């Protein structure tokens, strides 16, 4: 995978982890 696309996908994966925590903790 092209690196800049990969970095954008890593942004999404990290924000998804944050969404998981927010839901766990609400």
Numbering used by the authors: 1 to 26
Q: What do the paper's sentences say?
A:
We set out to design protein systems that undergo facilitated dissociation. We use a switchable target binder (host) and a flexible effector that can rapidly bind to and switch the target–host complex to induce a large steric clash with the target, forming a strained excited ternary complex.
Because state Y clashes with the target, this conformational change is slow when the target is bound, limiting the rate of effector association and the overall rate of facilitated dissociation. This slow step could be bypassed if the effector could instead first bind to state X and accelerate the transition to state Y. An induced-fit mechanism could provide the driving force: an intrinsically disordered effector could weakly engage with state X, and fold and make more extensive interactions in the strained ternary complex in state Y35, driving the transition in a power-stroke-like motion. The two effectors make nearly identical interactions with AS1, but when unbound, the peptide is disordered whereas the 3hb is structured. In contrast to this induced-fit mechanism of the flexible effector, we find that a rigid effector provides reduced rate acceleration even though it binds more tightly. In kinesin and other biological systems, it is difficult to directly assess the role of flexibility and folding upon binding in overall function; by contrast, our designed model systems allow the direct comparison of flexible and rigid effectors and show that the former yield faster conformational transitions against loads.
